């Protein structure tokens, strides 16, 4: 969360924002391999 | 909770080092004590569990005078057995008094087994009424534990001795004993040196060497009395669950033995369990009854049959007993273990309350009385007159034992409701 | 990636450990050797907060190959006993592993440092410590109580604690996890050492129990006899109404609360 | 084939029977749907594409022949049908796991639920689940550790909804893993945990109500008739001991049936079929399925329980007008022993 390279806190969401439908299993690895 | 075996006495010494050589063949143990390689069973209530799988017995092993024990330790089995518990008269004045000076060490034995335990049972006293030094020290001892542990039960595999009457005060001897057990010992069960010898010349030609032999028989019914605990069942998981039944009325608590297949060395359960009720296999030597019957099998039994079984044997009332107690006889299943010979597939066991030991206790009396008056052997050594001048707990074991004679007939009479 | 980067480039096991050992966690000998020197008397300022004497004693104290990022240097903060906090020591994490130690936790982690150096120094203040006869007994009465505390919280919740957290955190595998078990792990040792919850109800018992021991270490120096102390028996009244207030808080504990940590120590064996 | 729940939109799940192909027939489609199930929960994987590969084929040909159909489906069942089988008997454990369940359920074990009452009784007070519930599955893991079985054992979990009246089991098997358990199926079980803790508890009070050989008579003559119990003990002894031989045989007979059925056939539906008699059977035949026996049975243990707490209380021999409570025991108990002569009726 303070490591925010993904800012994910105001990246997806599910009224504010969007997030695509056949991606959505594979989220939090595609952020962890980012982190790095 | 894991139970102790007191083992004390030349002869219970050497009983209760068959006995747990024996377990070691049985379960999955080594001379040394280690698991075998080669092996399911409750080995936590009688062997103590070490970090490097030795797997060794809550023994308590009592020498008095050694001259067996010496050989005990010069065995392979040494290692196996090794709590490091050995702490140094044919009278049971000498062994009593004898008992009475090295009490508090033997009892501080006692209680660093008690405490490396998790917790504790029972003190299983491989005990020898009229045995010399085995004697008058087991009875001293007895009325020591149960006062340090209340709660805690005594249970006596005494080796009554009937050798068709050498040792000239065993009457005396055997008398005091059966006071402390009448009074002091929870649970006894009653083996006889004639019976295990009758039985010798029966299954075999062993007339002279009667008891070396006959300590194999006592090591299997002392085995197979403790192996629906040692296995796991469904029934009968602690030893007081079973005792319970065996025992309906605190005096009369001496159990009589049986096994269907004396020559052990395939057969229904509606035939094994009826053998134990032939006089043959039994190995004890006005109207009589028993007073409650128990039956364990082990071995490949059928489920269906067992019930049916029961119907059959009150079918052919093979036992005939009408006791104050109301406690029919019981099908008890248990496992038979592997590794070893599963000769006669099917084996069983008995153990019951029976007022026929009444009459063994007689016999003893009778000679007791009968020496009494001739007064031929007070002993009268300085340790006997000293210990005791008014020579008087005889007569008070003498007043006990009949009571117990007393209690036993009135059991057999209809009306045990009332005096015993 | 994470893992063996952060644990083979930037060690964060090592780190981690170093948290621990011979750090605001677990004192060592090293800690004993910075805290005797805080506590002596001998030229000590009012409350001896010279940042350079504090960061000298630490590097003196430093006692292993990595002797870095450790100042006892953060402001001390500006009380019924002397009761000095503030010594705030701050340790500085580089990129890398900062991920999972944040300058969040860093509050949590002081939390607990400043109660195990107060503890210490009770113990230390009534070590210190050697009607005259009297005196002697009271020591004793106390210094039990003081010393049960102590073993509870020294070794009871911190130390078995922290061993699953050492075991536990091989096991993990991922950053955010790893962000979680070591939240867990800082939200358990900061819960069953008495600093969360009910404070008025639990804590200021023990404060106040321990400012006991305090004035009676400081109203008292070795060698002499004439103490001419008639406050003896206010003292000793005081000790023995709080003490039965302590226990008897503790064992309200039955009907409602931590059972499992409190009935542990609610056997303090009273009298 | 790779097990896909709602394929489409609408026109776990099973037969829609309305929308049928008429030429399909329902015999057919009950095939179809089980192969559908086993998927959720193989070698399948491995023979997929031959399989989807058939399935193009009759895609292929231009009028369709329920008889190539047929042979198409029942290829699929051979390796479907008989292939959850395979996954449950052999890759699941189901034979194994059903040791544990009688293990660690229906008291199968002597170990674990008789040192477990021995370092739990003082839970006899009713519970507001308060402290309770925490220390009870605290003693069970603790009773565990006392001889070894020590693997896994994170699931077995006991709960309270009178200390010892509600200890509830609950056991964690997944849906994906094991189809067979269900919540009912369960909560059956449970009623029946239940009733058999209740007998073990009662037999462990007698067996330690066998204190006058222990204490009491033991080293003291005190008084014979003037103050005893009359050593009812153990004809109260006897009437639950020979419950318990009652639960023993039906048990381990249908047990047995039950393993050995399972060793037999092949067919996940008829093992199916075959525990659900298990269990069945177990109910009637121990008399749980609620019955005049059974209150009469509950009432016989609730006497048994009051002459524990009678006898309990009185340390030495002294008749503190116990004489009163026993007159009120004892010919309760001859009053109801004479109602378990219904069943000899």
Redesign the interface.
Known sequence: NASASSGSDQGPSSRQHTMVSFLKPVLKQIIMAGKS | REIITLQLGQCGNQIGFEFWKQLCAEHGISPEGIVEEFATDRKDVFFYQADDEHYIPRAVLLDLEPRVIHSILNSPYAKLYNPENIYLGNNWASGFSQGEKIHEDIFDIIDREADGSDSLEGFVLCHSIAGGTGSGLGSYLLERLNDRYPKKLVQTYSVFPNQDEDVVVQPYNSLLTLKRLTQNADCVVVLDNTALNRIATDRLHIQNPSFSQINQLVSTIMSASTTTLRYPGYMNNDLIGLIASLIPTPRLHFLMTGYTPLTTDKTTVLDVMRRLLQPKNVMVSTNHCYIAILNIIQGEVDPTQVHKSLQRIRERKLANFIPWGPASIQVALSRKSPYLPSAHRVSGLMMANHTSISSLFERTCRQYDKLRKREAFLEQFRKEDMFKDNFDEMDTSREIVQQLIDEYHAATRPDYISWG | ??MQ?LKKDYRLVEYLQAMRNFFLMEGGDTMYDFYTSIFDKIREKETWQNVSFLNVQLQEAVGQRYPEDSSRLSISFELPVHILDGLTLSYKVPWPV??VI?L?CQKIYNQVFLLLLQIKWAKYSLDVLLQIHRMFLLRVKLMHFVNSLHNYIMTRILHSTGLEFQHQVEEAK???QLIKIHYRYLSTIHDRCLLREKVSFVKEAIMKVLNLALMFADGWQAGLGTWRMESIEKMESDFKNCHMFLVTILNKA???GS??HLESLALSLMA | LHGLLLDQHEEQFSLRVEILPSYIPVRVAEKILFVGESVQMSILKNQEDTFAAELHRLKQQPLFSLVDFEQVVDRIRSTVAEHLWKLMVEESDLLGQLKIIKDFYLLGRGELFQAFIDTAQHMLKTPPTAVTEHDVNVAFQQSAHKVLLDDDNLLPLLHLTSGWAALGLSYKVQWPLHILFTPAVLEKYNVVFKYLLSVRRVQAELQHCWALQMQRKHLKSNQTDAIKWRLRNHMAFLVDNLQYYLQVDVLESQFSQLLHQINSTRDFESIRLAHDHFLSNLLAQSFILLKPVFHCLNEILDLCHSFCSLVSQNLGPLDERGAAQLSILVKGFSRQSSLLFKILS
Request: net charge negative; with cysteine; glycine share 0%.
């Open positions: 990636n994470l980067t900062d991920i944040s969040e991922d950053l955010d039955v009907c409602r059972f499992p």
